[PDB]
Amino acid sequence: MHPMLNIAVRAARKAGNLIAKNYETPDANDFVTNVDKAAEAVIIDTIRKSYPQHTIITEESGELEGTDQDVQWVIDPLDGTTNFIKRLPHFAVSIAVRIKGRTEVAVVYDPMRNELFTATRGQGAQLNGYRLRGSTARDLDGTILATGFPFKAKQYATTYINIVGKLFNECADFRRTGSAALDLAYVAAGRVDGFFEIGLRPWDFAAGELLVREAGGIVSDFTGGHNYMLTGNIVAGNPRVVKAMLANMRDELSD
Amino acid sequence: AMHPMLNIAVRAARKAGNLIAKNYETPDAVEASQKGSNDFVTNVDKAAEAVIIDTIRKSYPQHTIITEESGELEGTDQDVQWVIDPLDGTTNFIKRLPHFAVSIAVRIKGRTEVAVVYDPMRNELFTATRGQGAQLNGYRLRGSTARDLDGTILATGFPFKAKQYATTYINIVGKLFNECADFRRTGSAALDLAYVAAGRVDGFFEIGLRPWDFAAGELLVREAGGIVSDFTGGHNYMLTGNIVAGNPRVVKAMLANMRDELSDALK
Amino acid sequence: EFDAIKIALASPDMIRSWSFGEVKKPETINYRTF
Numbered sequence: 001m002h003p004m005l006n007i008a009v010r011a012a013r014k015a016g017n018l019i020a021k022n023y024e025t026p027d028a029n030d031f032v033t034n035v036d037k038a039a040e041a042v043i044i045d046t047i048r049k050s051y052p053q054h055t056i057i058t059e060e061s062g063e064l065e066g067t068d069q070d071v072q073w074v075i076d077p078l079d080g081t082t083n084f085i086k087r088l089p090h091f092a093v094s095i096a097v098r099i100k101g102r103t104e105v106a107v108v109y110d111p112m113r114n115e116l117f118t119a120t121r122g123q124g125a126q127l128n129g130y131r132l133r134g135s136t137a138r139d140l141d142g143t144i145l146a147t148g149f150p151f152k153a154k155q156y157a158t159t160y161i162n163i164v165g166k167l168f169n170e171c172a173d174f175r176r177t178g179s180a181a182l183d184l185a186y187v188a189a190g191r192v193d194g195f196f197e198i199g200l201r202p203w204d205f206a207a208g209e210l211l212v213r214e215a216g217g218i219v220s221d222f223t224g225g226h227n228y229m230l231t232g233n234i235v236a237g238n239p240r241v242v243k244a245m246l247a248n249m250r251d252e253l254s255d
Numbered sequence: 256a257m258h259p260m261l262n263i264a265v266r267a268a269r270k271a272g273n274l275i276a277k278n279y280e281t282p283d284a285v286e287a288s289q290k291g292s293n294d295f296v297t298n299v300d301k302a303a304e305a306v307i308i309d310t311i312r313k314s315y316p317q318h319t320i321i322t323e324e325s326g327e328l329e330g331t332d333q334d335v336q337w338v339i340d341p342l343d344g345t346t347n348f349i350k351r352l353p354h355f356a357v358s359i360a361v362r363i364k365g366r367t368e369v370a371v372v373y374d375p376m377r378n379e380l381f382t383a384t385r386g387q388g389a390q391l392n393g394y395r396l397r398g399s400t401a402r403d404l405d406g407t408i409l410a411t412g413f414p415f416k417a418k419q420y421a422t423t424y425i426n427i428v429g430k431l432f433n434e435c436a437d438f439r440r441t442g443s444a445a446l447d448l449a450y451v452a453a454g455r456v457d458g459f460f461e462i463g464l465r466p467w468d469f470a471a472g473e474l475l476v477r478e479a480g481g482i483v484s485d486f487t488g489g490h491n492y493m494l495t496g497n498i499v500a501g502n503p504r505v506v507k508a509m510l511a512n513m514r515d516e517l518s519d520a521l522k
Numbered sequence: 523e524f525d526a527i528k529i530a531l532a533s534p535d536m537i538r539s540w541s542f543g544e545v546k547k548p549e550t551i552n553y554r555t556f
């Protein structure tokens with residue numbers, strides 16, 4: 001399980017170097033698609049150096065299939081592109097190594113803050129040399145919830161709003177960064193207790209769900225099942241906050 | 256050259272930021288010490304405050320200082336005030352989330368004269384002085400170029416200390432979410448204002464802010480081409496803790512959008 | 523692009539927003555060095 005993660009972090013580092021080195025140029029969505037494509041190119045071409053047969057799933061061209069269909073590689077060289085558009089330095093590359101339909105390795109890497117969270121079954125979730133723990137919460141008092149708004153699917157918003165409302169009457173505060181993968185990485189390092197999102201897509205949160213799970217946490221769809229892999233209505237965290245949040249959010253189900 | 260008070264303030268901010276960063280890597284020493292309704296004041300806040308005050312007293316033993324902790328320490332020359340937040344978003348620090356900043360502003364005769372905010376993690380230093388403008392590590396700051404509500408990113412803070420208005424706020428939130436593009440919720444009004452100055456957010460609004468938090472950002476956005484106002488265009492914000500700011504056209508659109516949803520308590 | 527020309531007074535806030543600083547001294551150019 002070492003060499004897979006080895007190639008993973010290699011491609012991650014090269015992609016982050018490219019993204020940052022480019023980010024040092026001025027401007028005031030052409031450029032972001034340009035750099036997204038260039039990062040994907042460097043990523044995949046560095047990949048084909050080893051196992052040019054695993055099936056890559058990007059976020060743009062569906063599933064770039066391969067001849068060794070035992071391993072899928074979920075890729076997003078940029079998440080929450082809005083950030084890189086508007087100069088806000090919060091974005092990370094997300095690589096996920098999945099097998100047989102489930103995921104085994106995951107690496108999220110923020111170039112700006114130079115953070116790098118690795119995760120794999122059993123061997124845990126590390127931050128450049130840290131046995132992560134998740135948060136320590138057991139309730140929804142003095143807690144933080146990394147939220148997310150449907151900036152493409154505003155129809156839920158209303159009931160979503162209701163959730164927010166009720167959540168605000170229960171929790172302590174909210175966050176919003178736009179990089180769902182970074183929200184997941186933050187709940188992995190316990191930087192924020194609970195995470196939830198309405199209608200996400202596997203290419204982004206594939207690595208992040210593996211992160212939060214490996215860090216002693218658990219994920220779920222809005223209705224407690226596991227159709228999140230196809231529905232992306234994520235709710236994740238350590239079981240304590242997950243219960244404390246689901247108990248109050250399920251009663252407003254609309255998906 | 257450079258503005259003198261600005262220079263001494265940025266020295267103070269550098270020292271304070273270095274202290275905060277140095278303590279950020281030992282979460283076993285900084286504990287959670289709550290003050291009000293989820294406004295922690297850890298000992299590290301006290302240490303940074305003392306460091307800043309000491310560094311100032313060297314060059315102005317006579318200037319009255321204001322601080323959320325020590326209230327108002329009078330000085331023999333109280334025509335000029337030093338407003339400080341040694342830490343903004345104490346919650347973001349206790350969760351060890353690496354997004355916070357120290358804020359130092361100097362008012363002269365009531366009108367804010369200079370302001371600085373410092374994020375040690377990303378190592379970003381938003382400086383601003385009236386009559387010279389705003390700088391981010393050497394780059395001028397002209398805010399967002401937005402002129403509508405579409406594609407606009409709105410930074411905001413929630414009244415998680417004045418939750419009575421929650422519904423109201425949430426109400427307007429919904430309204431906003433019908434026109435804007437996306438929200439941002441970072442947890443430090445100073446840094447949010449700074450981002451407004453850097454155009455990294457197309458605008459900002461908040462309810463229930465202490466007078467010692469926007470004083471370091473309102474001048475920032477002002478000399479950053481943006482504008483601030485209360486929820487109605489007046490100037491009672493300095494007392495209502497209700498701020499709305501951004502580039503002028505976006506501020507106009509936001510005010511015209513919010514004026515209806517507004518609960519008449521804030522008016 | 524546009525299709526109309528809006529026009530109205532400007533608040534001092536607006537004017538200051540247009541500004542890039544506050545000129546203080548009337549003097550224009552050094553003569554010993556232009």
Ligand SMILES: [Mg+2]
Pocket residue numbers: 059076077078079080
């Ligand atoms: Mg992406």
Ligand SMILES: [Mg+2]
Pocket residue numbers: 323340341342343344
């Ligand atoms: Mg403070």
